[PDB]
Structures are given as C-alpha cells and as structure tokens.
C-alpha cells in the first residue's frame, strides 16, 4: 500500500474529523496484583512519552507497492483456490438489506458500537438513530444510501489499546480506517452469503477461520491437516498489500459467481481517507481495524500462501496444502517439510515481509507443540485426549486486567478473561482467582471455578 497524496480536507471539499485524543484506559482494581509492563498507545502527537514525530510513526506502515500485475503463480493460486471454493456451492445472490443491517443465518447483526464513518460522525448521528434490532426497520437506511451513496471516504481513528514501551517512544500506534456505514452496508448486501458460507465453514476448504469458536474449533483442525506444519508472522501485512492481491482477488470472485460486483473491492484497493483536517489517497493496502475484512484479507492469505509454494517449490501439489488464516494469521500444512525462510524470501518480491512464527529470531521447524493460531497453542486434554485445549498463556491474560475501559463492565472484562485462562491449568487458574479475590473489586465479582468451566466445556461438544 502506498499514500498518494495528502492534504487539508478543505482543499478537497471536506470538514474537520474530531477524534478523541484521551485514552479512556486506566489502572484497575488488578493494576498491582499482576505483573505488566503495557500502557495505552499513543493518541496525539504532544503525547509526553513519544521520542519521535507521531504522524511519521502512524502512516510509515504504507511500505509502498511491489509489483502491479498479477504474474503466471498467482494465476494458478487463483484457479485452485477458486477451484476450492467452488465446491462449498456458495449462493451467489445478493443479500437483502434486511438481513445485511439485522443479520441472519451465518452473519451477525450490524455492530451498534463501532463507528458509523463519514458522514454521520460529522453530523452527530449514530447507528441507533438508524437501525431498530426489534423493528428491522430499513427505511431509514435505504434513504440514506439513496441519499449520500456509497464509495464514501474512510474516517480514520488511532486505536486506543495496549501497546509495548518501545512502540508507545516509537509512535508506532495502530490505526483503524472505519469505512462509512453505506458501504459497509452495501458490501454485506453483495457479499453477505459469501461472508455466512465462510462462518459456516471454517476449516480447509475455505481456508479460513472468522467466525470460529476456538474451544470447539480446536478440536477440529488437528485432523485437518496433513504431516507436516509450516507458519510464519506477516510484518504490516494489511498496508503491505500491493494493487495486484486484489486482482488476484477479484478472479477468484469472478470465477465462484460474484463477478457482478467485484468492483466493491476497487473501493479497498485505491481508498480515500479522512484524518483529523487532512484527507489522503492510499493505492494498496486493506482497510484496517474492523471485521468486515478479515474475509477478504483470509482470502488473500490463500492466495499468497498458494503463490509463493508455486514460485518456489516447483510441481507441488496444492491440493496437499492444508491451511487456515484468519486474516493474516495463519497455520498451515503439507506431507512434505517446506522451508518458512526460503518462502520468506520468496515473499519479499511480493510486497510481503515474513517473519519467524510467534517472534523467534530464527526459522525454526514448527510443531504440534509449539505451533500458535490466534495467540493459542494446542494441548490435548488429559483425561479426553481426543479434545483439545486452546491454550492462551496467562502473560497476555495478566497485562490485560491491568487495566479497564469502563468500572461497569469489569465484570464481564473479568469473565472474558477466564473463559481464556482456565485452558492454562487448575493450578494456574486458581492461582489467579485467588490473586483477583485478594482485593475487593475481585472479591465481588461472580466468576466460574475450574471444576465448572471444565463441565460447560466437555457439554459444549
Ligand atoms: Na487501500
């Protein structure tokens, strides 16, 4: 991905996006009883612990374009992944507004918290003036499509989240490009049965894994994939996407029945950003921060991962490669040993930065013991060893509690935490009830023991 050009919103025809430049994370109850070394990322560029310009930091993810055309690889990733797919037998048709605001089998309702875009956050108004959960009313959102249309700018907002001390000196804050709620709109009515197939089946042939419940899930993949695992982390993946993945994409849309709209991925492909006074042109590079997506990006994954296995290995056989990405994570699989560095360097010709899976400094072999899908490893149960623990490692857990958005929902905050904790261990587990007990804000939560979340979970099957 690569900025074009940038300049005061004015120039161009639009108003000044406010955006909070307070974090609204603070020290919890649990601050002192667990061991943490987070704060809240950055916001603004007079924030007192930065040691170099904040605008540089922020948009230096957009490593620029690699190439521009879709080479003969690419193609054939194209043609077997399309293959792939074209055996869920997806429906084709577009998907009511009805069910694209409300949701329906397979795709959940419009989220009433997130941003609504431009231009409504410009003019005060929020979703709920918008949509009725009980009602289902669409009038209003169809007179608002037919009133400002769609292809609307971007309205882009730092992500106020936990980030290490050298990324907060470093300005290095993430950001979320919330597209306007027209678009969002009118994607899930183009591609809405396309999204309800994938959360449908996650797994092999989709090659991906949005919307997945990884205490169920976990048990499921092992028997998925072939003898061998290979993975690898993406570097900036997102805004290091050049032009050409979403041709590659568009094919495979063409190819399973969705050519009608493929021009719905132009929109992501060359975007059109609004941030505080300034407005920018971005050629690359995926919309950041939100779900509507992940899909996407997954499917892309596939086509990379296919791409790089042709360019490199010659005569392999795609339809031995087992792999699942959520977004740009991913684990992946094939009845042969493959080299993560050697496709690393295949990568960078592609506009893709490899690095070792899970931080190593090294490419080391990757293993059902130290494999990670979703920040989770993998741990047969002991007395069941045919269920498998998604196992999330407490530090991650512990740097967490340290802080809190809101005093009302520490509750549920708590509860989330444990539902990913309690895979640790009895041992483990206890330990940190026992730690959350030992001030009063812990001691009045209503949270699950061990022996409870172990029943929920052998009946959840
Ligand atoms: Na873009």
Same mark, same amino acid.
């Given at each position: 991905?690569?900025?074009?050009?940038?300049?005061?919103?004015?120039?161009?025809?639009?108003?000044?996006?406010?955006?909070?430049?307070?974090?609204?994370?603070? *020290?919890?109850?649990?601050?002192?009883?667990?061991?943490?070394?987070?704060?809240?990322?950055?916001?603004?560029?007079?924030?007192?612990?930065?040691?170099?310009?904040?605008?540089?930091?922020?948009?230096?993810?957009?490593?620029?374009?690699?190439?521009?055309?879709?080479? +003969?690889?690419?193609?054939?990733?194209?043609?077997?992944?399309?293959?792939?797919?074209?055996?869920?037998?997806?429906?084709? +048709?577009?998907?009511?507004?009805?069910?694209?605001?409300?949701?329906?089998?397979?795709?959940?309702?419009?989220?009433?918290?997130?941003?609504?875009?431009?231009?409504?956050?410009?003019?005060?108004?929020?979703?709920?003036?918008?949509?009725?959960?009980?009602?289902?009313?669409?009038?209003?959102?169809? @007179?608002?499509?037919?009133?400002?249309?769609?292809?609307?700018?971007?309205?882009?907002?730092? &992500?106020?989240?936990?980030?290490?001390?050298?990324?907060?000196?470093?300005?290095?804050?993430?950001?979320?490009?919330?597209?306007?709620?027209?678009? $969002?709109?009118?994607?899930?009515?183009?591609?809405?049965?396309?999204?309800?197939?994938? /959360?449908?089946?996650? #797994?092999?042939?989709?090659?991906?894994?949005?919307?997945?419940?990884?205490?169920?899930?976990?048990?499921?993949?092992?028997?998925?994939?072939?003898?061998?695992?290979?993975?690898? %982390?993406?570097?900036?993946?997102?805004?290091?996407?050049?032009?050409?993945?979403?041709?590659?994409?568009?094919?495979?849309?063409?190819?399973?029945?969705? #050519?009608?709209?493929?021009?719905?991925?132009?929109?992501?492909?060359?975007?059109? /950003?609004?941030?505080?006074?300034?407005?920018?042109?971005?050629?690359?590079?995926?919309?950041?921060?939100? *779900?509507?997506? =992940?899909?996407?990006?997954?499917?892309?994954?596939?086509?990379?991962?296919?791409?790089?296995?042709?360019?490199?290995? @010659?005569?392999?056989?795609?339809?031995?490669?087992?792999?699942?990405?959520?977004?740009?994570?991913? !684990?992946?699989?094939?009845?042969?040993?493959?080299?993560? $560095?050697?496709?690393?360097?295949?990568?960078? %010709?592609?506009?893709?930065?490899?690095?070792?899976?899970?931080?190593?400094?090294?490419? +080391?072999?990757?293993?059902?013991?130290?494999?990670?899908?979703?920040?989770?490893?993998?741990?047969?149960?002991?007395?069941?060893?045919?269920? !498998?623990? *998604?196992?999330? *490692?407490?530090?991650?857990? /512990?740097?967490? !509690?340290?802080?809190?958005?809101?005093?009302?929902?520490?509750?549920?905050?708590?509860? =989330?935490?444990?539902?990913?904790?309690?895979?640790? #261990?009895?041992? +483990?587990?206890? &330990?940190?009830?026992? @730690?959350?007990?030992?001030?009063?804000?812990?001691?009045?939560?209503?949270?699950?023991?061990?022996?409870?979340?172990?029943?929920?979970?052998?009946? $959840?099957?």
């Amino acid at each position: 991905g690569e900025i074009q050009w940038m300049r005061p919103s004015k120039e161009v025809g639009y108003p000044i996006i406010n955006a909070p430049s307070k974090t609204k994370l603070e *020290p919890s109850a649990f601050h002192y009883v667990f061991e943490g070394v987070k704060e809240p990322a950055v916001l603004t560029k007079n924030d007192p612990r930065l040691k170099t310009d904040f605008e540089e930091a922020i948009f230096s993810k957009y490593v620029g374009n690699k190439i521009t055309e879709v080479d +003969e690889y690419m193609k054939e990733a194209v043609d077997h992944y399309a293959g792939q797919l074209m055996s869920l037998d997806i429906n084709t +048709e577009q998907m009511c507004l009805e069910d694209a605001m409300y949701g329906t089998d397979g795709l959940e309702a419009l989220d009433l918290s997130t941003s609504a875009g431009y231009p409504y956050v410009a003019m005060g108004k929020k979703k709920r003036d918008i949509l009725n959960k009980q009602t289902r009313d669409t009038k209003e959102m169809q @007179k608002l499509l037919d009133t400002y249309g769609i292809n609307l700018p971007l309205v882009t907002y730092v &992500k106020d989240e936990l980030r290490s001390k050298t990324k907060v000196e470093q300005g290095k804050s993430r950001l979320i490009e919330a597209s306007s709620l027209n678009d $969002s709109v009118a994607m899930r009515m183009a591609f809405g049965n396309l999204y309800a197939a994938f /959360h449908k089946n996650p #797994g092999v042939i989709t090659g991906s894994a949005v919307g997945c419940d990884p205490d169920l899930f976990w048990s499921k993949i092992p028997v998925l994939m072939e003898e061998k695992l290979f993975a690898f %982390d993406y570097t900036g993946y997102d805004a290091s996407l050049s032009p050409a993945w979403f041709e590659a994409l568009k094919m495979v849309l063409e190819k399973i029945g969705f #050519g009608d709209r493929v021009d719905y991925i132009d929109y992501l492909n060359h975007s059109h /950003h609004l941030y505080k006074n300034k407005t920018y042109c971005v050629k690359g590079g995926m919309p950041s921060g939100c *779900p509507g997506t =992940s899909i996407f990006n997954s499917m892309i994954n596939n086509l990379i991962i296919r791409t790089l296995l042709l360019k490199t290995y @010659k005569g392999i056989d795609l339809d031995h490669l087992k792999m699942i990405a959520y977004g740009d994570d991913v !684990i992946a699989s094939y009845p042969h040993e493959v080299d993560a $560095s050697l496709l690393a360097q295949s990568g960078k %010709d592609y506009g893709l930065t490899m690095t070792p899976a899970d931080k190593s400094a090294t490419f +080391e072999t990757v293993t059902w013991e130290n494999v990670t899908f979703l920040k989770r490893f993998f741990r047969a149960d002991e007395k069941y060893p045919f269920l !498998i623990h *998604p196992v999330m *490692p407490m530090k991650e857990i /512990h740097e967490s !509690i340290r802080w809190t958005k809101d005093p009302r929902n520490t509750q549920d905050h708590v509860r =989330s935490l444990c539902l990913l904790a309690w895979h640790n #261990g009895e041992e +483990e587990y206890n &330990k940190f009830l026992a @730690k959350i007990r030992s001030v009063p804000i812990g001691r009045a939560l209503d949270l699950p023991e061990y022996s409870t979340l172990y029943d929920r979970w052998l009946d $959840s099957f």
